[PDB]
Amino acid sequence: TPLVHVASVEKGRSYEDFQKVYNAIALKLREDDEYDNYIGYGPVLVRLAWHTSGTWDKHDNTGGSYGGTYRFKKEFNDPSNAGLQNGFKFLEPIHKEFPWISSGDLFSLGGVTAVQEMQGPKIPWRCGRVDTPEDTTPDNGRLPDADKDADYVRTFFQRLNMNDREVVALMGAHALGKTHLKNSGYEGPWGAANNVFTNEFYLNLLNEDWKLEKNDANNEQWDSKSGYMMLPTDYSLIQDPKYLSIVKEYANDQDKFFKDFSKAFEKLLENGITFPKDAPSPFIFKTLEEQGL
Numbered sequence: 001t002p003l004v005h006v007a008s009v010e011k012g013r014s015y016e017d018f019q020k021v022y023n024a025i026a027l028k029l030r031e032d033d034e035y036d037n038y039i040g041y042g043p044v045l046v047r048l049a050w051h052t053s054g055t056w057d058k059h060d061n062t063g064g065s066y067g068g069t070y071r072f073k074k075e076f077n078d079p080s081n082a083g084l085q086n087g088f089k090f091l092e093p094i095h096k097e098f099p100w101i102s103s104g105d106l107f108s109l110g111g112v113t114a115v116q117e118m119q120g121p122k123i124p125w126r127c128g129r130v131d132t133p134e135d136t137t138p139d140n141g142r143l144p145d146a147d148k149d150a151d152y153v154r155t156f157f158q159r160l161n162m163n164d165r166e167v168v169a170l171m172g173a174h175a176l177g178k179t180h181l182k183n184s185g186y187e188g189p190w191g192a193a194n195n196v197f198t199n200e201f202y203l204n205l206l207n208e209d210w211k212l213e214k215n216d217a218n219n220e221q222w223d224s225k226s227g228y229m230m231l232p233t234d235y236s237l238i239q240d241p242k243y244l245s246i247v248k249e250y251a252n253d254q255d256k257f258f259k260d261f262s263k264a265f266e267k268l269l270e271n272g273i274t275f276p277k278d279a280p281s282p283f284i285f286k287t288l289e290e291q292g293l
């Protein structure tokens with residue numbers, strides 16, 4: 001038997017209200033710019049949107065972005081979530097300013113905000129997630145391991161109802177940010193421009209001379225002379241012939257990657273949620289640049 005989670009618009013709010021939150025997040029991202037050696041909070045926000053959505057299980061409709069359960073200690077302390085506390089504390093002051101927004105809508109909106117402010121595509125976003133009680137927090141272990149191969153990646157993502165194209169598009173977000181030894185047992189960025197959203201991950205995967213090395217934490221990762229790295233799960237995208245075809249596609253067509261990421265990422269943030277027919281349409285927020293702010 002599966003739960004239903006129906007979206008309920010937080011009371012009386014409309015587009016102008018959520019655009020105000022987006023703007024608060026965007027402004028903080030622009031100001032609090034020294035985090036992680038001047039990477040900024042963009043990438044950890046996108047990670048947090050993904051980890052809070054990616055506990056979903058299509059089989060019983062548990063986990064996912066709806067309940068905003070990352071705020072509970074079981075989930076907050078998942079070892080897979082190490083590092084994400086920085087994204088939570090970045091958002092805490094925003095939530096105090098806008099205490100009406102649910103936690104789900106805030107964690108997911110922070111990811112949308114960060115992608116758009118890092119010059120990525122527009123991601124339509126829908127409001128309506130409702131905080132659910134502590135007893136609905138998912139058990140640890142539902143997020144993926146990095147030391148596995150393409151068959152594991154494919155199987156993992158089937159749980160999230162993601163197909164080959166969706167998975168490859170979604171992994172393009174590893175253009176952003178970096179791995180941190182004390183968080184995950186891997187270290188280094190995937191590329192040079194790690195707070196601008198581009199198709200650089202696919203380019204570097206195909207074009208770099210990758211060497212399998214062991215890092216100071218005794219885990220294997222692929223390293224290049226440029227100073228980039230790839231997780232084994234990243235690198236398996238060029239080992240699997242189906243994945244590789246899509247990697248080459250996104251490497252050679254920026255616009256296609258952007259459109260495919262937008263669709264897949266929205267779906268990720270909306271998995272598990274039922275929207276009434278009279279729910280508002282998806283919002284497309286303007287960036288600070290488009291507003292002239």
Ligand code: HEM
Binds near residue numbers: 146153177231233
């Ligand atoms: C195979 C599945 C994935 C694995 C194994 C994986 C693994 C990791 C790991 C280990 C990190 C580094 C954390 C750290 O120690 O600082 C990382 C970072 C990141 N992941 Fe993935 N990830 C996966 C999928 C995704 C997806 C689907 C997204 C897109 C929403 C995503 C977005 C990010 C981002 C933005 C970071 C950078 C965070 C930061 O820079 O602080 N990852 N990932």
